[PDB]
């Protein structure tokens, strides 16, 4: 009689229950499959291991992320996560709960449809929803309007919403994420000598850049001052005892989302995505948009990047605007508190995708009920 | 339940055994160490035969592969500590806690395989409970002391 | 329905029953033949010798090793040894029980091939396998990840192994192994007028070895205090009443090891093979590695080979790590320890290569089966 | 007044004068030490051998490459290198001659600085400059668009360059070379019951590798092929005069580039690494560079690994793609050919790294004038 939450990102699942304030299983979205030679007997009859089971022994496994840029790419991977998320991690039966997914907005269609079919055909779900990440992060925000942008692994996307209204024309997505800037750390880290090829130094590189990396508030000031001095240099210890340390790199790193060049992309930052959309929507809600910045996901969680993000957009706004950048400390959480709001409302209740509907209309009915 | 007293008596004796590593516990020296050591092999056997009719009543695409693959391992397990404290039992006997360590190596691997088998027992049971077989076992998902998981921490 | 467990070394011969604790046969793998002339009537018709039978007369015989550095090279004596092994020292029938037998890894494909072939059609074995030394002394060990070091006779091999999955790349062997050290220590015997140049001789130095030579944790301050004092000679009586005196010979033959230049090798020694070997390794699994350095073998049983093993893996390894090495007591059979454990597990009896596959694919099954 | 061109590989110095069509100097890049005992006065007073001086003598020498993988790890051995190659093999005295250098992309900065000192400080050169191995080699094969795969001693690269303009976020590096099929070679050649340990051992092996090994077009019909007959098995004298045969190694070994998990690699073939590339690249490029798929390298000399190549590439690109690869004949040398064609250019007098620049900006001025 509770409803379920699970929060699909590309790079991890978060997934807990509705009503309450935070996720019950936070775990990485891979699974991982050994690599190696068998040579113990009874060691090597499980092939394939999902989420933190994978973290733990990555270094005899080939990780792989069902999700790139938001899209299921494997399918019979993705059913493995969500069996796990099910089962081993929250331990309930899905058959008795409706669960709340969530999406980025301008990604396939057969994206969703396939969602529903395989929740309400292998799991047995009496009800699903498909819902927007964006319009759960400001659901958590605790407000109506504003233009939230979320990062997240495979992801960057701007969602204007006024008094509730959500303005699609003004929609941005942009796929440059966290992955992005893990893959552009592990080509930049090469300049030091430091070498991280396999899926597992990966995901060493992914903490690496958790760990030590901001957000600069001037680039071309703090490039001189990594130059100048060797003040911004700090260590990390490898899982095998080497130190490796990094000066510019910090902050080289994130700055791929306001300079997307550094990747070769052609696209523009994310104050200028966030400043256009602003631009697309109606005049008479741009001031209301400029001051509710929600910023959500684990990519804006670099330090300094609210304040980067107000100077930019304040730069590019008008000067008699009124620029606020809102970051919640738990916004890594915002999408699936959100939607932990949602699917406990009371208003809800009646737009469920409940199994008749799907028994009559196909899995198309989730374009039409979400 | 019997798989849970079972994993959970288990899992005393391997607090036993942990509690000698740190040097202060309810056994002396490597003596009391192999009798531990072989009693919770015998109970990982016991385990195995639990495991296995859990198994016997599951479909075969079904998470009986998860629960077989633990099963395999906690066999080995099982089998490695009762030679190997047949071994240090007779190197006693001709000439340690240098020795205790492969045994105490030995019951922590058990006592992990043996907790994945738990949770794939659960699971085993919870997802085929009206299917047939599984209903004589009589494991309706009740008898599984499962907590709910605990939240996350929101700010780390 | 027993099995049989022969660990074939270079040196000795190790077979026993699988389930068993120690095993029940352990000779020398020698063969003996006369050189001198039979003068008695009768007393010179046998025309061989095996095993201890061989070592008991080896005043009048020439002594002959069938296997060199792990290989077998007389086919006609090793078929000798392993007729002596079941018949006279087991006493068994071998069309009976299912034999396990050891091979050494990187070791040439033949070897193994005339392994099965001379089981499945000599001997009429109904089934047998092919083990790797070092997995059986992991299995021994009561582990599933660690890196084993595994000295004998004729080899000395690493083979690091994670989860019970091996890493076949990084797996060394050095052709430099207890041989090599009675050979040193006859060469460096002379330096003190002590001439053995027979096979029989070779035994006494063998003997001599095993009981008077020690690994120096610090070389140079032992060459240092042989050379001031005198406190470190000890002495020796050969088998007619001579007595021998040897100072720095004790740890000068042990030190080819760590220095295989002594004997004029370029390779590296065992520290150095043993950190290569952990280098090519996942760097997840490193940590694991260095605090499991199980040693097997019996050219691993000299006072003092733990202690300066840790020290220069220690010295090589980053110092946040936690090297231990493991040297269990009874070492020194810990590959047939493990083989019984093997041959006796459950898991294990639908590994064994029945005659009717060797009947079906001739002796190559043995690379594909093992 | 003419400019030099020294082409630093991990295996070999290619070194001659821009303007020419051929190096001057081909030498193997070692340096060689002895390692026994100098008995004869006089003969062991030379204490270091560089290029063919060290295989000529390498029997009784260590040889060790200063570069492995491209990057130069013995700053002193790496000095006598080049100290050689310029007054030995050359005969030109270093200051009136600029130095072109090549480098490998994706590389540590470090390297490339070193470099720079070395030669304005030790080599008192006018000017020096350092291109990428894969620009060089499409000059040399007189295009200025196409996707080059370089494969050396040390490293495998793919550099996408189209008309003259380089997609850096596409550029490849596989630290997986000629040296490590070397290697695994000698890993692979213990089946048969041959020992190559030694450093000497390892260029007799570089030896068999260049003149027997070849690509297989398929590589399971290979080894189907290889199993039922002996038509496949060739024969190579040792330097003593014994004969080895060798069957199906002859194929194993290059197919490491294709399947680099036979030496426990992760990554992906060369095929796929290249399609990989092409696949970052902008989606109206990608035509001409499938059909311009410059091979360069002495790794990519096997017989067959051109038509394997575009077999490979041609399952993986849409079936109406024009896929060309393009390897010539002499393109052992295109790198060395492209610098020669790049350091005569009249154009390019004026991209030379001066020492004024140099004394003004440290070695530091590498990275922005290169
Ligand atoms: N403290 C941090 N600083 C920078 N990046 C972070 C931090 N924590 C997480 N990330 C990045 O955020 C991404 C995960 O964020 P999340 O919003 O969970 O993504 P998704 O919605 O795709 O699951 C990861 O790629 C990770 O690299
Ligand atoms: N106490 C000892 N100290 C040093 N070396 C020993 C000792 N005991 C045996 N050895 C050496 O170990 C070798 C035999 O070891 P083992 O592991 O049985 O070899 P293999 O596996 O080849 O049979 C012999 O060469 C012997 O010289
Ligand atoms: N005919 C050949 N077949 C296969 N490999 C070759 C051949 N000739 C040279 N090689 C390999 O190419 C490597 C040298 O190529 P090169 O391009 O000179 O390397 P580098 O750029 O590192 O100097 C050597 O490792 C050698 O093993
Ligand atoms: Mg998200
Ligand atoms: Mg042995
Ligand atoms: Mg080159």
């Not at chain 1, 301008?106 to 779900?125: C, D, G, H, S, Y």
């Not at chain 1, 003004?170 to 300049?191: S, V």
């Not at chain 2, 003596?31 to 035969?49: P, T």
């Not at chain 2, 693959?69 to 240098?98: F, M, P, T, W």
Request: some cysteine.
């Amino acid at each position: 009689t509770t409803a379920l939450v699970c929060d699909n990102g590309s790079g991890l699942v978060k997934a807990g229950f509705a009503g309450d304030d935070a996720p019950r299983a936070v775990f990485p979205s891979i699974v991982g499959r050994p690599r190696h030679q068998g040579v113990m007997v009874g060691m090597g009859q499980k092939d394939s291991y999902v989420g933190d089971e994978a973290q733990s022994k990555r270094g005899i496994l080939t990780l792989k992320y069902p999700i790139e840029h938001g899209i299921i790419t494997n399918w019979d991977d993705m059913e493995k996560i969500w069996h796990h998320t099910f089962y081993n991690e929250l331990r309930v039966a899905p058959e008795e709960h409706p669960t709340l997914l969530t999406e980025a907005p301008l990604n396939p269609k057969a994206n969703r449809e396939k969602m529903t079919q395989i929740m309400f055909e292998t799991f047995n779900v009496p009800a699903m929803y498909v819902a927007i990440q964006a319009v759960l992060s400001l659901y958590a925000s605790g407000r109506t309007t504003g233009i939230v942008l979320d990062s997240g692994d495979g992801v960057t996307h701007n969602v204007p919403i006024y008094e509730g209204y959500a303005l699609p024309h003004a929609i941005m997505r942009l796929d440059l994420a966290g992955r992005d800037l893990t893959d552009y750390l592990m080509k930049i880290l090469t300049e030091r000598g430091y070498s991280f090829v396999t899926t597992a130094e990966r995901e060493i590189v992914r903490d690496i850049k958790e760990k030590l990396c901001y957000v600069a508030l001037d680039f071309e000031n703090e490039m001189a001052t990594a130059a100048s001095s060797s003040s911004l240099e700090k260590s990390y210890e490898l899982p095998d005892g080497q130190v490796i340390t990094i000066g510019n790199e910090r902050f080289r790193c994130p700055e791929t989302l306001f300079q997307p060049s550094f990747i070769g992309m052609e696209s523009a930052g994310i104050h200028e995505t966030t400043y256009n959309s602003i631009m697309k929507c109606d005049i008479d809600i741009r001031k209301d948009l400029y001051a509710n910045n929600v910023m959500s996901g684990g990519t804006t969680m670099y330090p300094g990047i609210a304040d980067r993000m107000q100077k930019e957009i304040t730069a590019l706004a008008p000067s008699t605007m009124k620029i606020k950048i809102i970051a919640p400390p738990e916004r890594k959480y915002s999408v699936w508190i959100g939607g932990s709001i949602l699917a406990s409302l009371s208003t809800f209740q009646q737009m469920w995708i409940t199994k008749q509907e799907y028994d009559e209309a196909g899995p198309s009915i989730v374009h039409r009920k979400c | 339940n019997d798989i849970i007293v079972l994993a959970k008596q288990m899992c005393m004796i391997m607090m036993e055994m942990t509690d000698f590593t740190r040097g202060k516990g309810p056994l002396k020296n490597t003596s009391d160490v192999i009798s531990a050591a072989k009693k919770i092999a015998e109970a990982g056997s016991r385990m195995d035969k639990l495991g296995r009719t859990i198994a016997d009543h599951c479909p075969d695409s079904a998470c009986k592969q998860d629960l077989l693959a633990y099963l395999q391992r906690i066999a080995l397990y099982c089998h490695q500590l009762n030679i190997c404290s047949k071994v240090k039992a007779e190197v006693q006997n001709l000439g340690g806690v240098d020795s205790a360590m492969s045994l105490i190596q030995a019951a922590k691997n058990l006592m992990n395989a043996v907790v994945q088998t738990v949770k794939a027992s659960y699971v085993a049971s919870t997802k085929y409970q009206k299917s047939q077989g599984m209903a004589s076992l009589n494991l309706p998902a009740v008898s599984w002391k499962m907590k709910a998981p605990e939240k996350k921490p929101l700010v780390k």
